[PDB]
Every structure is written in structure tokens, then in C-alpha cells.
Amino acid sequence: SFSAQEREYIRQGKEATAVVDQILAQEENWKFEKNNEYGDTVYTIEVPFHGKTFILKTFLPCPAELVYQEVILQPERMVLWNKTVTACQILQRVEDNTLISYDVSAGAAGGVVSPRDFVNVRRIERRRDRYLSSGIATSHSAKPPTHKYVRGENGPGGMIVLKSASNPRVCTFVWILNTDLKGRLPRYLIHQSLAATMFEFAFHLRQRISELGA
């Protein structure tokens, strides 16, 4: 038993997950975009309806299970160490695998790209060799857009932790990000701000993992 609205949220989470699996199977076709001194690499891939999608890939010196807990399962707690986001509230839960959240991004690009708020549905799956949280924009009557923030809108994307088949003390983290921030800044500037936000995110994750092992 689920209302028609809860079934629509469940379908949206499953459709986002199908796109994420598709992007992950097209790894050989990712286009290198940028990397940094820590070896964090950002790629892009052109996806059928949502367009250009960014992908951060970073290896982490800890077991998959741990990242899964800090990033994929404690979304509300992430706000404390993940400085690229200033708020996260779960508005509603459907079954055990799908959640509807409200999220506010921190200002970015040295203040050139202002904060955005978002309403997302996301779909957590624990598999044999990986853990995923896939999502996409949705609507929720408790969080209509307001004058306080531009209401950004995520296309399909998510965060994935890939278990290492050869060394269980390490894992690989992948963030697939497709978002429309709206407004009128030129697209190249938004893109540079997204890449930069992904490296800051990796920098906070790495930091969080280190304090959690000391």
C-alpha cells in the first residue's frame, strides 16, 4: 500500500538509479575534465536528456562500509563536515530505500555562484560490490520555491562507493552530478564552479575519514 504520490517517488528513485548504473557502465567513455594535486579526477559525459553530467572519482584509504555510513546513510550528519552544503533535512521517507530531502548548497566560486536550495528524491541500494544513493529533483509541497534562494534542480546523479575486490582497507568514491542552477551566469562559469565544488567536497571527505581513523 502506497499513495499515488509515494509510487511516483519510488519510480523516480528507480529511474535515477538506472541512469547512474548506465553512466557507471560507460566509464571508458568518460571525458577527462580536470584533476588536482590529490589525484581527484573530474570527468564529464553527455547524457540523453539531462545533458552534460560531471563525475568525481576519488580513491579513499578506508573500507567501503565506512564511506557508506558517513556519506550515503547519514545525509543529515554530513552537514557538519561537508562545508559545500549548509543544510539537509529529510522531509519524508517511503519504504526503507527511498527518501525525499531538502538541501541548501553553500555559496560557491568565491561568491560568484550564489547558494541554491533543492528538493530531491533518493534511492539507496546496497549491492554485492557497491553502495549507491541515486537521486533526481522532485516536488514536495512542504518545500515550494521561495524568494530566499534560487531553486536549483538536479538531473539524475548520485554518490557511489565501490568496494575493492583486492584490498578491503581501501575503496573508490564516485559522485555523479548533473544539475541546473538556473539564473543567468554563463554555463562555462557554472561548470568551473561545479568542478571546484567537487574538489572541495573530496577535500572534506578525506578530512572526515582521517579524523575517523584517529
Give the DSSP per-residue string, the chain: ---HHHHHHHHHHHHHHHHHHHHHHTGGGPEEEEE-TT--EEEEEEETTTEEEEEEEEEESS-HHHHIIIIII-HHHHTTT-TTEEEEEEEEEETTTEEEEEEEEPPBTTTTB--EEEEEEEEEEE-SSEEEEEEEE---TTS---TTSEE-EE-SEEEEEEEPSS-TT-EEEEEEE-EE--SSS-HHHHHHHHHHHHHHHHHHHHHHHHHTT-
Handedness of CA 162, 123, 28, 153 (dihedral sign): negative
Give the CATH number of domain 1-214; options: 3.40.50.300, 3.50.50.60, 3.30.530.20, 3.40.1180.10. 3.30.530.20
CB 206 within 8 A of CB 38: yes
Q: Which amino acid is at 42?
A: V
Handedness of CA 3, 14, 92, 120 (dihedral sign): negative
CB 120 within 8 A of CB 100: yes
Rounded Cα distance between 34 and 139, Å, is 33
Reading phi first (left if > 0) and then psi (alpha if -120 to 50, else beta), residue 204 is in: alpha
Classify residue 66 as exposed, middle or buried by CB count within 10 Å of its CB (0-12, 13-18, 19+).
Answer: middle
